[PDB]
Design a protein around this ligand. Structure first.
Ligand SMILES: [Mg+2]
Ligand SMILES: [Mg+2]
Ligand SMILES: [Mg+2]
Ligand SMILES: [Mg+2]
Ligand SMILES: [Mg+2]
Ligand SMILES: [Mg+2]
Ligand SMILES: [Mg+2]
Ligand SMILES: [Mg+2]
Ligand SMILES: [Mg+2]
Ligand SMILES: [Mg+2]
Ligand SMILES: [Mg+2]
Ligand SMILES: [Mg+2]
Ligand SMILES: [Mg+2]
Ligand SMILES: [Mg+2]
Ligand SMILES: [Mg+2]
Ligand SMILES: [Mg+2]
Ligand SMILES: [Mg+2]
Ligand SMILES: [Mg+2]
Ligand SMILES: [Mg+2]
Ligand SMILES: [Mg+2]
Ligand SMILES: [Mg+2]
Ligand SMILES: [Mg+2]
Ligand SMILES: [Mg+2]
Ligand SMILES: [Mg+2]
Ligand SMILES: [Mg+2]
Ligand SMILES: [Mg+2]
Ligand SMILES: [Mg+2]
Ligand SMILES: [Mg+2]
Ligand SMILES: [Mg+2]
Ligand SMILES: [Mg+2]
Ligand SMILES: [Zn+2]
Lengths: 208, 99, 104, 88
RNA sequence: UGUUGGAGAGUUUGAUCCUGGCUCAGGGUGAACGCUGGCGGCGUGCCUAAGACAUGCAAGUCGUGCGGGCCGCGGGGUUUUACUCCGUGGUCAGCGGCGGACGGGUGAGUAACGCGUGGGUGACCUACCCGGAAGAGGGGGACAACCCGGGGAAACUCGGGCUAAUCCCCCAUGUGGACCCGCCCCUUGGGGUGUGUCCAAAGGGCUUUGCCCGCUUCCGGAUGGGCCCGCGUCCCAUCAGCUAGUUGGUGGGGUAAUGGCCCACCAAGGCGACGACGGGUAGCCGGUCUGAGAGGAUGGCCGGCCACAGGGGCACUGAGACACGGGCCCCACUCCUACGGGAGGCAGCAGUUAGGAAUCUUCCGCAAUGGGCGCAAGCCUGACGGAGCGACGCCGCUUGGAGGAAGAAGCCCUUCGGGGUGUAAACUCCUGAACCCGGGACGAAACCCCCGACGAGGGGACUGACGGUACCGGGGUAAUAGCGCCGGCCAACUCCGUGCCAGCAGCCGCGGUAAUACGGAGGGCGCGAGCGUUACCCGGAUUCACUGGGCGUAAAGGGCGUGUAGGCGGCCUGGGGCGUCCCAUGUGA
């Protein structure tokens, strides 16, 4: 049970806009709209020049809270990375962005990640045919990520794809709104991702 | 109790006295076969050798000595004698002594 | 293959027996400096041919007692008290360390 | 007796054996002599038996006695079909 | 044993710098304690009393080796009688073959060729299995069972008599082999050869002129193992000298084989500062943890090796034992005892009790993999395959998802306008773990039987513990959260209480009436079925420094010299080529 509870206070703590709700966090109400100061009884007071540790920290809780993963699943992937050939940095993201519960977000099947986490749980998604209710499942290059046949008829899902009619997809994905299907072309490269992050810092945090 | 594995310790004994006796014999026949040669009685010591010698390979046939326990005995005795018969003897029967 | 070692006799006191000194040489497990250590092996002289300070070679063989498991192949220089004198001179020292108390 | 038997390596409910050659004496899970292949009873991956006819035969000619089970498997490979024709 | 690798801070001062110890942040744990605790997968779970253990179970198997006792069904011979012959099912024990030397436990002991690594055996053994040669002739005997009697409180023991076989023994036979001795080729007991001597054996079973099983000797393969050697293996020199079978030698004993392994005699040596001897500690390794690496720490699970099975000694039988569930004696211990004498050993699975901060079910299965015995059917097998208990660890899973006001209530703060918890809840809609229905398997194919030739191959049939479990299909409800911290290192701040008190504390310290450092509240950071704590290992610690430190005054130059072992060594050429470097290869499971 990772977090689950108030979100926008997270958005307000990192000081940057986080899309942890899909809709709304777009219309005048993600709080960061006329109230970008942190939560608590001192969110409005003045902030003191952060410690090298504070920055590295804040920057992590960001990268992570965007995907809503336990610091646990978070870490272990970091390691996976560290070990793989390539720039620790992006290699990290690549994987992070390879999570089914996530891919289901990018492909649009759901308004945002958390919801996608769920859809995966309740078995409304499929990979190569055999459904998968596992959020942390790593999508490999060449795997169709379709909607559960018995789910293609749910209002919520139809609603989602209905509005995708037009929304382009990451050049590392592609979908077939008709057959409500969509492939994972290839691991998205750091550029391809527009994250308000500085993974050169997350990295630095786990170097302590 | 009563694992009926005491049968093994029941056979053994029957085999203890079994072995014990053939060997003991071999020994006796061996030594006795010596004494003679030592003294000089030509034949009488070879004649006994054969028997002695035999007993060996006989106790050896089974599992009293087996292996090369039937190779020291033999060779060893076939020396003490021959050699103890190095006080002017001339193996007349030269039985167990390829001369 | 049976190992051959080359050393220097150092005692012919026993019968059909010779005490040979094998100096070996190796770098440190943790300091790489080169180093010398030595071992006394007890080999057999069935001919009493090898005498004090002769530099011999040695081979593994049928144990022939507690400690002796080597032999004396053949010579390598029939004379060198130069080194025997070292060993003999090392011992001579012990004879004088601790106890005796030259102070009493 | 050097015998060709199976050895357990997989984990709990996913057993994976080995056509090892050994002493009935050791435990069919300890040191061995060589490996003649494997077999996964479960039958998931297209590759099951992997018995190396070659070596198999050789241990057999030496006296390695295969279990009833070790046999069935070597028989599926061909550790037993000695070339014939013109007549069958 | 991998190839992207290395963050520091606090603290001795009025202030500074250096030194230098203490301290923290990290990671790991067969863990324990606290608070809390929803599911699953795999893993793992006495680390202390190698203390003591009740009961059950952990090695047996073969009637195609053999003969009987017993309960039973059936068939003969003496026309009805006692008697007796045959077949046969079950059964019990015995004689005998093979297994009990594997598998399973523990780590006490051991600093040792115990282990690791690599070699040696012209110094060796190896049941069963496999290939190849040759053979299986004749004869004789016993001990059990069973029958009689005797001793015993038992445990159990003794004497008396009969009988069988693949049990024992003698003779014959010998492809051969063993030994002595002569010789040859090798070269420490390798191989070949000569006359002499010595040595084999059993039968059982059926579809009976056929074949299955078995048996004897011998050479080879196979595997396993003994022995030996180089090298490598902690701490203390306030342990410095140890040693008499101890060092060697010859003869002999013993063993499968070398050997002081054992004995007799002769010689007197062997080991030691390149640490003998002694004390302490410790099973060793593949590997594990940590670390930038070098290194350090460790060796529980799995695997290989060793050692032990109440303490100690010893041998019998066997290919193998000096034999965990075998045997003999002594010791201690509990137990039966008519006290004369006997009985046991969980460091096997499971449980008990003691100890302890602490460690589980007296389970199910023999379906599978494996081992044992058997022609086979099959028997056995807490080995193993599994299930249970423990958040003990790791990995996945949930407590919901979108929407939802310049913003409820409440609680907090608020030089009192308002800020905060907070879109958090309410409320709406969507999805739907649990739970219910029906379906439910992989792990299982052969051994057997039939055709075939008893091959090859083909045909047939039985076969589950886990399970009615996992998993699939349908219906389906929003349906556990906690815990640590928020002075500095270390991310998180106000108020109220308390007043050097009560109390915090890892270091520095905080509290004596404004405390961001005590306690509660609100809030906040962290992590989440977990979080804190304690203990111990590595890290930080270049704080033992090989990589990587030091000694004028900070800890550190021996008061000086002489000189031993040792370490180190100018210039030129040539041999070796030990070190050193390189290539190949074997080993490095
Ligand atoms: Mg979560
Ligand atoms: Mg944070
Ligand atoms: Mg989402
Ligand atoms: Mg018994
Ligand atoms: Mg007996
Ligand atoms: Mg002999
Ligand atoms: Mg040296
Ligand atoms: Mg010696
Ligand atoms: Mg095994
Ligand atoms: Mg590598
Ligand atoms: Mg001060
Ligand atoms: Mg009989
Ligand atoms: Mg009766
Ligand atoms: Mg009649
Ligand atoms: Mg019975
Ligand atoms: Mg019986
Ligand atoms: Mg064992
Ligand atoms: Mg070795
Ligand atoms: Mg001659
Ligand atoms: Mg020899
Ligand atoms: Mg370091
Ligand atoms: Mg026991
Ligand atoms: Mg079986
Ligand atoms: Mg059978
Ligand atoms: Mg582990
Ligand atoms: Mg519904
Ligand atoms: Mg260090
Ligand atoms: Mg220093
Ligand atoms: Mg020079
Ligand atoms: Mg060289
Ligand atoms: Zn937001």
């Amino acid at each position: 049970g990772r977090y689950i509870g108030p979100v926008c206070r997270l958005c307000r703590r990192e000081g940057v806009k986080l899309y942890l709700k899909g809709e709304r966090c777009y219309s005048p109400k993600c709080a960061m709209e006329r109230r970008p100061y942190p939560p608590g009884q001192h969110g409005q007071k003045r902030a003191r020049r952060p410690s090298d540790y504070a920055v590295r920290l804040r920057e992590k809780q960001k990268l992570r809270r965007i995907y809503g993963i336990s610091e646990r699943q978070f870490r272990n992937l970091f390691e996976e990375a560290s070990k793989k050939k390539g720039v620790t940095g992006s290699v990290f993201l690549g994987l992070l962005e390879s999570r089914l519960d996530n891919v289901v977000y990018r492909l649009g099947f759901a308004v945002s990640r958390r919801q996608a986490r769920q859809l995966v749980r309740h078995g409304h998604i499929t990979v190569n045919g055999r459904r998968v209710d596992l959020p942390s499942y790593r999508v490999r290059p060449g795997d169709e990520i379709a909607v559960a046949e018995k789910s293609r008829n749910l209002e919520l899902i139809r609603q989602n794809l209905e509005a995708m009619k037009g929304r382009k997809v990451g050049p590392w994905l592609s979908l077939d709104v008709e057959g409500m299907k969509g492939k994972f072309l290839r691991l998205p490269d750091r550029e391809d991702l527009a994250l308000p992050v500085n993974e050169q810092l997350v990295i630095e945090f786990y170097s302590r | 109790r009563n694992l009926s594995a005491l049968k093994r310790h029941r056979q053994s004994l029957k085999r203890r006295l079994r072995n014990k006796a053939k060997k003991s014999a071999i020994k006796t026949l061996s030594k006795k076969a010596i004494q003679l040669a030592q003294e000089g009685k030509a034949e009488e010591a070879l004649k006994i050798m054969r028997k002695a010698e035999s007993l060996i390979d006989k106790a050896a046939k089974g599992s009293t000595l087996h292996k090369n326990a039937a190779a020291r005995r033999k060779s060893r005795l076939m020396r003490k004698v021959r050699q103890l018969l190095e006080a002017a003897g001339a193996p007349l029967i030269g039985g167990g002594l390829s001369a | 293959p049976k190992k051959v070692l080359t050393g220097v006799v150092v005692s012919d006191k026993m019968q059909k027996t010779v005490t040979v000194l094998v100096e070996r040489q190796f770098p440190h497990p943790l300091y790489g400096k080169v180093i010398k250590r030595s071992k006394k092996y007890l080999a057999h002289d069935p001919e009493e041919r090898y005498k004090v300070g002769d530099v011999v070679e040695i081979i593994e063989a049928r144990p022939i007692s507690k400690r002796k498991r080597f032999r004396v192949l053949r010579l390598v220089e029939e004379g060198r008290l130069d080194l025997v004198e070292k060993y003999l001179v090392r011992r001579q020292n012990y004879a004088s360390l601790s106890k005796r108390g030259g102070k009493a | 007796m050097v015998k060709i038997r199976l050895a357990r390596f997989g984990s709990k409910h996913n057993p994976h054996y080995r056509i090892v050659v050994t002493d009935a004496r050791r435990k069919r899970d300890g040191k061995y002599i060589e490996k003649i292949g494997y077999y996964d009873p479960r039958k998931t991956t297209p590759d099951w038996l992997k018995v190396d006819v070659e070596r198999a035969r050789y241990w057999l000619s030496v006296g390695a006695q295969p279990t009833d089970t070790a046999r069935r498997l070597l028989r599926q490979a061909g550790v037993f079909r000695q070339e014939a024709r013109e007549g069958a």
